[PDB]
């Protein structure tokens, strides 16, 4: 139940040791959020990250005392408009977005907000990653990240969750960003999810989900059939199939008995959804009524390490999410050193 | 999870004993379907129904003997084109659909098909219910039912599934029929699911699911917020709320902590979905990877007793589905004693 | 005139290779008008008919109708035929990513229309004729799903209007609700080829409610259809957009639109939508004083034709003669 | 030809009840060869008094080149020099001043024979008009619709008669509406029915489709609904649809295959789903059937005005003018009621 | 002249009301042009200004600009104001079914634009003026979300063109991209009532690129807007569709369109889309010889105006004078 | 002054061509304001006017107006012109697949607007000026159908605002309801070349209600129009999306958007739709205190301009002076 998460913690430790013992600097814009602070007590004990809290230092240190969490007494607290880099950060956002309606006045007002300040910190290398969204809706938390840090080349911003089963994990995407991805977008989501599965030493086997089995009819069935064709043309080395129903996808015996002509054998471990209603409802329902741990969402497709929590998260969910944000920050920091 | 199903079995028996010992006559158009026949061995042993098989008697009896299946030697096997009521049934389908493109030629050709013949048997009272779809896709199996038996007044054809948890069940709909139901259709689906929950002695508490919490924004959030408003005016005695995410819906602690203004307290036990992708994927994923039994889909909104299996069903799934079809057939047969 | 030469043309083909008559399967084994027509067709050695149905029910109808020549016609019940499960597997193989698994294939192959289409596809018959008792959409769907269209073809119905110096070809009278400019050009090329098979020069008009207006909508569409077809067959006279009397009357064309590329009157009329084609051929047939034969299904890989359900017995006879000709043509193409 | 001779006799019969005066029919195409040749017959048969529009010199020159003596004293009116010209300009302006027609536009339009003819009819200086022999239908019909307009709940629609051996068939709308709605197809049907009743015949109406009683999305559903709407407005008539064209006209096909239908004995009024189907059908029947087809006749408009098909023969013009004369006489009676 | 009369009504209003001046909050406490304008406005007893920001950095800007009269001005930092958490709760109460929970409400209320809107909404200020340093959309959204539109109202920007003998009103210059006919009628009525407050008879033109054409698109929309508005205020001259020179020039209208119901020239011009209204007032402002004041936000429940970010120091002075007038009018309405 | 310099260049062009004056045909031979304008224009040796109409009714209007220099003006009645039937054949030749047969061609060619257009097309006149009496759409349609656009040209109206230090050019003020980004760039290039003919460097702003936002709709379209135009004339300053005051005021541009490629103020303003351009130039003309001349039709193969029907007499004089300049320029390009 816990095995995949403690293997992640152990990989964070191996990465820290291979780099002087340094921990990733993870900035939290919600410096007074009760669940973030309670989670950070566990995370600092486990040497997962060096946290940076954003807010008015007096009020963050007020909240830490009311919650009685001494292990954070040293933790750095930064008030955005008083940080020495504020004016350079204002200038950078203006430079990036002056033809997207951000003049100096808009940049100045946005950079005062902790979410924008956290995103620019990560973009500029003043932090290695960020974790936000514990106290506000996903759209408002993710917009600063997409506008500031942006997507890498050909990337698509997309949320991913792991369902931690007994044999294996299953990856679900896109659980957070795209309302109704096109066939081309679902293929790119599949490739992004696939390289994450490969990072963990697993063979990705991809199903494009629908309410139909290999019907190819207009609408969602046709879209997910074409998504699988596009993804296969970009990664012909992977098993990728669709359109198919969700039990057809995960159960190898159903697949073999009913659709043995299919190219997907042994059950899918990457499930790509046709719309945001389906992915968002599915991972949340599994999390609540299944008997498996679900971790995420993790934001993929973006140039730097940045993750948005689901606002319904528990304290333990934040701990799990920061562990994988630390792993992502370490990976990206090593890419930026080659 | 065996308790909710064994209680249904005992209610089928109590209904039979309260009516002369009659068992409900359930017709199965797929007379040679391996899983249907294996299921019927258990269903006859458990005195759930009088099964009627459709097909060529020697091909059906050959399959029963090749599978070594007892208790089916007395079972009625009917070939549609040789049944005495065939031409009357042709006459009736023409009468019903002559301005929908069904002349006598079309009616004769359709009525030779077991799925069409089974539906007319139920419509005309020659059977008390039917169960189909073990060997063909849902759209093709459900179309004869909707075209022949049709919806009751203001009903909407809609599939419903039960998730049987340890302390409660959850109802999911519409898992099979409507691709993208309107706000008005999602209210009617909720009302149909609510009356099913009440038949089992439980108070229904209804959530209109979205990827959003009380955002009411254009698109799905607005549709599901409005669907809850319509349903509240139609059943002002019930807790009905939306738009909300799936974990907000089922977890009473999340709702109270984050949205205490909501009218839904104590957790939803009826989940109404915004489109068929989300509902169909969700119940199949829960069934495969959750550790709870999922029964259904059950076709609601139709004038007579008729259910379509998921073609991915197991034999035990068919046994479970027929138990509840028997209950529906007994209930409708007793309403028709007015 | 035109029909008797076609009948002789079937006999000419039979003698030339094998001596065998084309095997034509009729899925509607109990259809009264089909059975009455087959009395004439067997007497004239047009085809070896294969009827689909329950043998005893088909034999009751033949006896009840008192038709003597059908005493030993072959009658086949789909589910009992030795090739039934082979046909089921083939349909699954063809359509498994179009929603047809083995369960769907078994259910469909028990239906005579599907079984007839597969018999022809597999070479167990040389052609089929259906649609005497059901609507065209339901009769043609199994053919298109099983046999399919040839490379770059478009399924399209074609009718012949038989005047005294002339025949006119009308298309597409049955399939496409609202064909695009590209589709109307392809329909034109398919019709032009049938006309050439009968030794006639095809002269094609893309019909509209307009004369060379080129305005948005149907006029622009039919103007472009003629341009596309001209680029694909630069050797033919093809013109549009033009009205129907402009198209067929060489005098109106010369007097009012001498700049047009179509002179001497069109004998191939391509229609802009299915309302116009379907109503027009049926009205000419009923109230005109010319015989109309067809519709004939063009663009498909094997020989298969769907009757209009309003057909007379004599209309079935005419349709089967040309189905036999198509079957012989395709069957001889399929050796080389 | 029986049906045409009976119409000719009713024009004379109507003339006898009013002093012997003939309807004044204006022809804007004063130099059109086929119009002039047709008028020689029409003046001979006392169908109408024609009024030609143009330059008197060019019109009388053309009459002389074709050697048609019976037209050497027909009235010729040049729009811009006629005494009512400035009055006509003011009227078109008064009618269309919030439809983009000012005094400048009205002066320019009224100088054109088609507009001048339409206004002559609108103002009672003529009893009817016939145009469209030399220009496309759209340009000929637009001045009529803009000047005279539709009567209340009316719809502009062209109608043709197929004169069979023992009935006529009415086809509509063969000229105006590209793609009428179900509601418009109902109104076209009612307009055609009242014309059929004028000739002493019972109207039996079919809404044509490529389908028989399918009711499927698109044209089948539209023509099924057109029949329902029209039936509610004239519950005394047989009106049915959707149905195919041979189903509609052949009583034996209808009785054999669709005995539940409300249309028995065959339709004599065929209402078409779009302009492609109606325009092609009447032209093809006219060219290749062996029945006479007369029209199109413009229905739904407040005064008598018809537009010929530009492909017309001289005898077609003669046939069309006879029924325009009848229409002109009918409207002149109502305008005294 | 029109401006001295507005100032002078603010003064009469302040008189007879204890000497009280309207409390106007400016969220942009460090904005150079806002501070420079306030030197003139407090000097002239127009308003008691409240500046939002970090007090220490606002006084820093005031000293750099050498404005000694602003030393005693009230400066409020949103997050430390005693009512801050009360304001958070109010926004949550208003917008909890529009996606604003306590977390969102608390984050938004820390922003000066949101804090100013709530101050006005709760009666802690009598009006607000924003938008000198950020785009109009970002400045107006908090006002629309917090204060909202009154019943049947439409949010719409309005400008006055102050000519020598008269003023012209233009709307909607800021809010609606492409108003419907119904919205353009409601905009006309809102502007008409403002003109009546200044003692003038409103004469309304619905502007288009066409004169009385009524053709599909913009001509039909503006013809219909005038018909709708005429039915709601039949006592007023309201006409359209018409071009802009037809609208303002009584001689052109009389010479070319004497049938029109608009005589004596329009003084209210309602535009068909935001491109036309926004470009028009700015171009007249830059190259004409007339003063243009505004835009003024109409249709909202309390006094709140958004500057054009291109404003001069005089523009801000002009705008605040009329915001003060609006604030005083509203405060009396809320006194019954 | 700008107009007086134009008149002098007409004379300088005339002197260099043997003293010949351009032949300008006016289809509105009886239009009061045209006739009064021609009194000034013939006195100023601007053009040789040709009036269309009935020679008797035209001379009847001239004498009643008392215009002595018009005594020997050429007056042409289209149906009586010796080239009439040649012109009918030419219009038929051009448009026979656009719905114009010989009958339509005869009827249209009898209309002065069509006849005036064909005279210019065939070289029987050097230019035409119409639209004093009728709406712009009806006046411009014959020109576009007969003369047409030069290759890749776009028909577009242009107006000059004659300011004190400079002029501003506005387009497209008359033709395109809602030009695409690609069309807006082409309008910019045409306007740029006219400004260069007057010896001035064009600086182009793509106008919007937004400043450099690039948001969907008009902002994105005008940002993209500027990008396309820059790639076609990399030597010019061309920028967008921007508001109208940002565009014309160099101090606003430098203070608020110094990253912009446009410095020193735009003198060419390209509008996003016809509502904005048409209302703007008419409002500036009526309530600004600067003269506005035009509209002038650009993008067409020959010299032809449509007046605004609301024009004054002095406006027609101004318009004809520049039509004369265009006619003279075009005649030496056609001597290649």
Author numbering:
A (entry chain E), B (entry chain F): 439 to 776
C (entry chain A), E (entry chain D), F (entry chain C): 441 to 776
D (entry chain B): 440 to 776
Task: List sentences quoted exactly from the publication behind this structure.
Bacterial hybrid malic enzymes (MaeB grouping, multidomain) catalyse the transformation of malate to pyruvate, and are a major contributor to cellular reducing power and carbon flux. Distinct from other malic enzyme subtypes, the hybrid enzymes are regulated by acetyl-CoA, a molecular indicator of the metabolic state of the cell. The larger ME isoforms (hybrid enzymes) are predicted to be a fusion of two unrelated enzymes; a catalytic N-terminal ME subunit and a C-terminal phosphotransacetylase (PTA) domain. The PTA domain is homologous to PTA enzymes (that interconvert acetyl-CoA and phosphate to CoA and acetyl phosphate), yet they appear to lack critical catalytic residues and thus acts as a sensor instead.
We generated an N-terminally truncated mutant, MaeBPTA, spanning residues 439–780, and determined its structure to 1.96 Å resolution. The structure reveals a departure from characterised PTA proteins, forming a hexameric ring with D3 symmetry. The classical PTA dimer29 is formed from one unit from the “front” trimer, and one unit from the “back” trimer, giving a triangular array with dimensions of ~120 Å across by 60 Å deep. The PTA fold can be divided into two subdomains—d1, composed of the N and C-terminal regions (residues 441–595 and 738–776), and d2 (residues 596 to 737). Together, the hexameric assembly unique to MaeB has two isologous interfaces (isologous defined as the same face of contact, d2:d2 at dimer interface halfway along the triangle edge, d1:d1 at triangular outer corner) and one complex heterologous interface (d1:d2 at the inner corner of the triangle). HPLC analyses confirm that this protein construct predominantly co-purifies with the allosteric regulatory ligand acetyl-CoA. Acetyl-CoA sits in a shallow groove formed between d1 and d2, placing the bulk of the ligand at the inner corner of the trimer. A pocket formed from Y576, T614, N718, Y721, K722, P735 and Q748 surrounds the acetate moiety; a single acetyl-binding residue, Q683, is provided by the opposing monomer of the dimer. An extension from d1 (residues 524–550, forming a loop with two helices that we term the 3′ loop) sits over the 3′-phosphate group, interacting via residues R535 and K538. The central pyrophosphate region of acetyl-CoA sits flat against a region of d1 (labelled “face helix”), making an electrostatic interaction with R581. A loop from d2 interacts with the adenine ring; residue N616 hydrogen bonding to atom N6.
